[PDB]
Amino acid sequence: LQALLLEQQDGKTLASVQTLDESRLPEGDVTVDVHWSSLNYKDALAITGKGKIIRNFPMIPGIDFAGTVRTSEDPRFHAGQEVLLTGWGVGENHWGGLAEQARVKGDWLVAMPQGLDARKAMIIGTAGFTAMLCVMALEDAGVRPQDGEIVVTGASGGVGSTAVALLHKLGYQVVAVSGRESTHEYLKSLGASRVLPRDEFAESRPLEKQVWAGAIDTVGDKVLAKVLAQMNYGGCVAACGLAGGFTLPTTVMPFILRNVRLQGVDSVMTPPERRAQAWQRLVADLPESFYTQAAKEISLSEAPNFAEAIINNQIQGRTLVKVN
Amino acid sequence: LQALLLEQQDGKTLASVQTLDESRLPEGDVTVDVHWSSLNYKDALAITGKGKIIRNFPMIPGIDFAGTVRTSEDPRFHAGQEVLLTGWGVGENHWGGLAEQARVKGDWLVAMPQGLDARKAMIIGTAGFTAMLCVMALEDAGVRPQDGEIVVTGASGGVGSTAVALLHKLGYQVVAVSGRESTHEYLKSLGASRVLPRDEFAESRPLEKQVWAGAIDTVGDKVLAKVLAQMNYGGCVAACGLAGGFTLPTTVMPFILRNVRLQGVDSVMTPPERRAQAWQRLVADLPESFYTQAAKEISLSEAPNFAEAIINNQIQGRTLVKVN
Ligand SMILES: NC(=O)C1=CN([C@@H]2O[C@H](COP(=O)(O)OP(=O)(O)OC[C@H]3O[C@@H](n4cnc5c(N)ncnc54)[C@H](OP(=O)(O)O)[C@@H]3O)[C@@H](O)[C@H]2O)C=CC1
Ligand SMILES: NC(=O)C1=CN([C@@H]2O[C@H](COP(=O)(O)OP(=O)(O)OC[C@H]3O[C@@H](n4cnc5c(N)ncnc54)[C@H](OP(=O)(O)O)[C@@H]3O)[C@@H](O)[C@H]2O)C=CC1
Numbered sequence: 001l002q003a004l005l006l007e008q009q010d011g012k013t014l015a016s017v018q019t020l021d022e023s024r025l026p027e028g029d030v031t032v033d034v035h036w037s038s039l040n041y042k043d044a045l046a047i048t049g050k051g052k053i054i055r056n057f058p059m060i061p062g063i064d065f066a067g068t069v070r071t072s073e074d075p076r077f078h079a080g081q082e083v084l085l086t087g088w089g090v091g092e093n094h095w096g097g098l099a100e101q102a103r104v105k106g107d108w109l110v111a112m113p114q115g116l117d118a119r120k121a122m123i124i125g126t127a128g129f130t131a132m133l134c135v136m137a138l139e140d141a142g143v144r145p146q147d148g149e150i151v152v153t154g155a156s157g158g159v160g161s162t163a164v165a166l167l168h169k170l171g172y173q174v175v176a177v178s179g180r181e182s183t184h185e186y187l188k189s190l191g192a193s194r195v196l197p198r199d200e201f202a203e204s205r206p207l208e209k210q211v212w213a214g215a216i217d218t219v220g221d222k223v224l225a226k227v228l229a230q231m232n233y234g235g236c237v238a239a240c241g242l243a244g245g246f247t248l249p250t251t252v253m254p255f256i257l258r259n260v261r262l263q264g265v266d267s268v269m270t271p272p273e274r275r276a277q278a279w280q281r282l283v284a285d286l287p288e289s290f291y292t293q294a295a296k297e298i299s300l301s302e303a304p305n306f307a308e309a310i311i312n313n314q315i316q317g318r319t320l321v322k323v324n
Numbered sequence: 325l326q327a328l329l330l331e332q333q334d335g336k337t338l339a340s341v342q343t344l345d346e347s348r349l350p351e352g353d354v355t356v357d358v359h360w361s362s363l364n365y366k367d368a369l370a371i372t373g374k375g376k377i378i379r380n381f382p383m384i385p386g387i388d389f390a391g392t393v394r395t396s397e398d399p400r401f402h403a404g405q406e407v408l409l410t411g412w413g414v415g416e417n418h419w420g421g422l423a424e425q426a427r428v429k430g431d432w433l434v435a436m437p438q439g440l441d442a443r444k445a446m447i448i449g450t451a452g453f454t455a456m457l458c459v460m461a462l463e464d465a466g467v468r469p470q471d472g473e474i475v476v477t478g479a480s481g482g483v484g485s486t487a488v489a490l491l492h493k494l495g496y497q498v499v500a501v502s503g504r505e506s507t508h509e510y511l512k513s514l515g516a517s518r519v520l521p522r523d524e525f526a527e528s529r530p531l532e533k534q535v536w537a538g539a540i541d542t543v544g545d546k547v548l549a550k551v552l553a554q555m556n557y558g559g560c561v562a563a564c565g566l567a568g569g570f571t572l573p574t575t576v577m578p579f580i581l582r583n584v585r586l587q588g589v590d591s592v593m594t595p596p597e598r599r600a601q602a603w604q605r606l607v608a609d610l611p612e613s614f615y616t617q618a619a620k621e622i623s624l625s626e627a628p629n630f631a632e633a634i635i636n637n638q639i640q641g642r643t644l645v646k647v648n
Binding site: 224259261265 | 580584
């Protein structure tokens with residue numbers, strides 16, 4: 001059993017791949033032979049030791065996995081069945097998916113959606129799952145294509161890439177915000193009508209000119225504050241991230257004078273029914289071209305190279321991890 | 325034609341009751357003989373000159389009125405008809421309701437709902453209208469009496485008083501936040517289960533203990549920031565005010581880790597359909613005891629005094645205004 005393992009000394013996190021035994025895995029009524037995982041921003045924070053994502057060491061990181069069920073004391077799952085997992089504290093406070101085996105509670109698993117397989121499921125991963133929940137939040141708020149432009153921040157990343165592709169597919173005019181010139185052609189190829197620079201979202205009045213029918217935000221901080229000030233009357237912002245900072249120095253003005261909805265989107269504890277709905281929607285609404293335009297396959301032990309890259313804003317798209 | 329008129333010299337606002345000619349009224353399709361108005365927080369800002377609510381003087385303030393139609397060039401409205409008005413820029417950049425006559429666009433009016441008269445309509449006013457929109461926002465977010473406690477800030481005020489009464493009638497367990505010990509009995513009599521002091525809502529961590537199923541906030545600033553940190557997973561905050569300050573020094577944490585919705589509530593430009601729904605619901609759900617328990621009926625020339633009291637956190641309930 002090969003596993004990426006986090007250890008802690010003198011404050012710092014060390015990441016290495018070690019050969020563990022089956023016996024070291026935590027209790028959990030379903031054992032899964034993991035074939036694929038991925039790197040999300042939260043995984044990168046954990047692996048580099050930034051932000052105190054993980055409080056208990058040693059720890060196998062990886063909030064995502066997909067593979068084949070080895071055994072099951074949960075009668076909903078059987079040996080041979082393709083399953084996936086995102087969230088539920090896995091990869092944070094419970095040994096995760098960046099390993100050839102994981103053991104988890106059956107409630108945390110999702111039976112493989114029809115039209116999907118383990119590889120494609122992990123290209124999507126937590127970031128794509130989260131993008132879908134964000135699109136669904138915009139739809140719950142009555143934001144339709146004809147209402148105006150949708151803005152996506154941190155657009156070149158995982159959630160952002162998925163969001164641009166989903167929205168373009170669903171008929172929306174999408175505007176991407178990126179802090180790098182090198183992402184422009186990639187973002188246009190995903191379906192973005194144009195790409196605005198991040199340095200134009202550094203400061204804002206409480207109320208800016210109305211330009212967005214809706215928004216999907218992955219950066220928080222001053223970018224989210226400006227986006228809120230730019231929302232159309234009745235518009236909605238689906239906020240899922242903190243890539244630019246966890247604080248939100250905003251005002252009540254967009255809320256109380258423009259009836260703006262700021263919908264928070266969490267992926268960790270998404271209830272079973274909405275979880276299943278999001279996956280079903282991804283199979284239908286994410287075009288097959290995405291799985292080759294946005295994905296980069298890496299091996300397990302080179303994950304820390306790419307975790308550093310994520311933190312350092314040197315990553316584009318989705319990092320798929322082949323575990324075997 | 326009696327009217328509270330605001331002038332401006334040396335950057336200070338001067339409020340007085342003057343007798344004006346009919347010919348000084350602005351152009352409008354519908355002339356209304358106003359019998360009743362009210363004072364909301366916004367009117368108080370305008371009358372005292374605090375903030376920049378009013379940019380063009382002279383101005384008749386008053387974002388609300390109710391009365392009888394005098395003349396009409398708009399075929400939807402006839403002489404003799406009972407009508408009300410809240411918002412639409414009236415009392416801000418168009419001569420308002422604290423006067424014996426107003427002249428307005430027919431789109432801005434609401435035909436008197438059945439079960440309601442001009443007096444009761446202004447006891448409710450913008451503040452009560454707003455409270456109803458906030459309760460409706462909580463319902464849109466799936467918050468039900470069984471889900472847990474609803475917190476109402478600035479509870480002794482107009483929006484707050486209406487909110488507590490509406491929620492108690494609808495079956496919710498309500499918790500009021502007030503910064504004065506003198507409001508406690510009043511708030512209990514409206515339907516509040518308990519009253520927490522406002523000094524316990526000053527500083528907050530990004531995430532506090534989950535305690536609120538939903539919230540209606542009239543204060544903004546640091547009170548709203550703490551309430552956000554205290555929301556249950558999937559909870560909703562309807563935010564409509566800035567009584568404690570217009571800034572919002574919060575974080576993204578409640579949003580991204582607890583799926584919290586921050587629904588902003590505006591009353592100025594609420595579209596016709598939603599507007600009519602709120603008034604219909606106010607007739608259904610506001611108990612008759614509210615009109616006696618929260619109302620204080622003043623004359624036009626007492627409006628500057630009551631405006632000061634509002635800014636200085638010295639009123640309780642709703643200020644109704646007998647215009648004639
Ligand atoms: N709570 C939850 O359940 C979930 C939360 N998330 C959140 O979504 C957010 C993004 O996730 P993911 O796509 O995986 O991360 P990525 O790193 O792949 O993308 C984030 C993007 O943000 C931009 N960015 C990076 N650094 C900064 C910075 N310092 N200031 C401003 N912008 C920056 C970059 O785009 P560019 O170069 O174009 O500016 C980058 O591509 C994360 O904060 C993550 O926590 C995601 C899934 C679930
Ligand atoms: N955008 C829109 O369409 C609408 C906005 N609103 C807003 O709702 C808010 C309240 O309206 P309204 O009820 O009419 O005003 P009120 O003055 O009647 O209510 C405000 C309450 O807030 C509390 N308060 C007052 N000052 C402070 C302070 N400095 N710090 C903390 N709390 C304070 C008081 O309660 P206590 O003493 O118990 O602490 C007071 O009763 C206003 O900001 C108003 O503009 C209302 C309707 C519509």
